[PDB]
Amino acid sequence: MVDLKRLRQEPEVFHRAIREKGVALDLEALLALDREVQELKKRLQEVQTERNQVAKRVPKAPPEEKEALIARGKALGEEAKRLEEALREKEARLEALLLQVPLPPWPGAPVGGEEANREIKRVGGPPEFSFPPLDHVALMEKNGWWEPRISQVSGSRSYALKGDLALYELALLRFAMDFMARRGFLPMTLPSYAREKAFLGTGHFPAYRDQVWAIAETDLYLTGTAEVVLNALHSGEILPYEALPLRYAGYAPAFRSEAGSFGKDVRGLMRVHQFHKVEQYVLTEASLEASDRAFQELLENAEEILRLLELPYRLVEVATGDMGPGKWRQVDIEVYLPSEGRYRETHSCSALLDWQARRANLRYRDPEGRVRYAYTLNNTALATPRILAMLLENHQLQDGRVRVPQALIPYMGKEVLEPCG
Template sequence: MLDIKFIRENLDTVKNAAKVKNIDFNFDLLLDLDRDITELKGKVQELQEKRNSHSKKIPKASAEERPALIEEGRAIGTELDAIKPSLTEKELELRNLLLQAPMIPSPDAPIGNDENDNVEVKKHGELPQFNFKPLDHVEILEKQNWAEFEKIAAVSGSRSYSLRNDMVLLEMAMHRYALEKLQSKGFTLVSTPSLAREEALVGTGHFPTGRDQVYYLPEDDLYLSGTAEVQLNSLHSKDILSEDKLPILYAGYSPCFRREAGSYGRDVRGLIRVHQFMKVEQYVICKNSPEESNKWHKILLETSEEIVQDFELPYRIVECCTGDMGTGKVRMYDIECWVPSEQKYRETHSCSQLHDWQSRRTNTRYRDNDGKVQFVHTLNNTAVATPRTLVPFLECHQQEDGRVRIPEKLRPYLGGAEFLGK
């Protein structure tokens, strides 16, 4: 969330941010509300001062003067009471608008309209070459009895899946490996609930837009979140941390849920777009410094690269353009792993820096070494998300005899097995 004072003083900059992010934002309404609120607050202050001054006259007034003064005081109070609902309503409307105001993207971020304008910055690994007809991930899973799709869809609805046997163990191995790697790098491991209150989703920026992607439980007034970032971002809501406690590094492990609204007919096969998944999320709270944010952005990206390399998957890194990065992002990279059956890279990790866009929403601050209170910066990146990562993993490591090879780094988590399957 941007500060209204910043918007007033940098209107052209914020308007340009909306333009390059393809966000339709009503700046005229925002400025009108801001002006109305300023005027109403001035009127409230004026009336309060008048009432206070007036109330001091009553004790000194004669018996004959007192009734008129009391009535005049009541009239001032009535006028105040008439203004306050309008002020409250306009302040709420202004806040709702501010929650949708775009963060200023980095000047180094590529300008573009959508994912087609993202810029490839790195490729790593050799694409697999098969001397046999390779299977796609669904064919591999069904051949080995590693997943079930049709019957579980009848029970749980479309875009559901049920992993079986070795796939359950492989999924757990991937997450265990990622968690141990992050712990070795100083991250605090956190298992987070999937349930979250509305204010937590507002805090990350998933709300007020994005409601159509989230499952809602009306009887409990709770939501199912699509990432542990939602809970981790609100753990220090309203806190004033000390600078020596920063950075705070969290590795959040949780079941995640996403409605995938608007994606019907797209990527419906197998494990690609499902409603429920497991994820280890990297989350960083650091000092209010672009240099510090850049440093941690690089570290988060490199850590995910290490994991993908240890899984021995060919991948590329793309920098997301302004039109694809989202409202709150300052800069964003995706890691995309190679899917042989589709002959293309698919996103498996998303690495974002948001500066103080989230911390202003949650009012998370720190007192620096000079005693100044500042909003923290936040960053996040996927460490491992399954079953998404299983798609390139199974397809890239399949063998002619139907088995799937396990990279050396994962074998200790699977009893030393070099291959899975028959």
């Protein structure tokens, strides 16, 4: 949500945002609609208040003038319900539209879709294997580390891990939570469902509605990221300046409808409906430099986890067309997946300024007593099973076993994932 005041004052700024980000929104039609709502609230002021006057004149009016006043009162009331109900219809239309206005991207955002994305940096590289490398599904198949029968039970885009890899999954999630807690984020284990209001807050509703699974006969939705929950915790609360920046490391199961197919056909561990994710969430003050400092920390944290995971990665500046309506700036971190001879997203770091704060109503009292919308940022800390696709392929040994990175040997108990059966 954008400040309707700034929207009215400098709509060309939002017009470029709608153009470069590709939002289907007619800014001129929204702006128009707003004028009508303004107009109709004023006209409704007139009738409900002339009605106030007629009703005030009624109690001691002579019988002649008293019924004239009832007559006038009725017509005016008619008018008022007509206007009232027109306003409500128009305002709902305005709000829905307002919910589609995107934040302007940062000045250096590449303009265009995913193909405009720009590699910032690359640390580490494709492993040079002494032998012919298997892909992660073939490592799993060979060591008996996943349960293919899960598709008959739950459907496709499901996985069930077994043996050492079951254990490894859990070790990586705890690892990421421990690493976030030593970086000063407050670890939180959270639910994977939220009411609608929390999805609206983040911006997942309306634009990414397609992607969320509703829990039927409830008013709950399962969340695709712990971010829907972390962002809505302080809605309607005004935070002390001294609380800022809030740094939450939230773990929750994530659920995605994944209404959108894998061109690299369908499966393995890359795109499943249910996965586990530790999220990095920050609420900071409404300054660009506070945002920039948080974005760089969010980024370095994710890089740091990849270095401890010993994975080759690169950072990518996400183009306007691809960052989504509420993003100021987005950088993805992609890790190399040998079997596809390409980098794959494992983390997206977004800075959304106050676009989510004005929707989720997140506010703080600045050093001068002024209440302000906060700025929010988020980045993945670690999501499984997807990084398992990359750990298996980058760390596979000759025999098909997989070495665990040094930092994860305390969490596993061992240096090598053994086969199951």
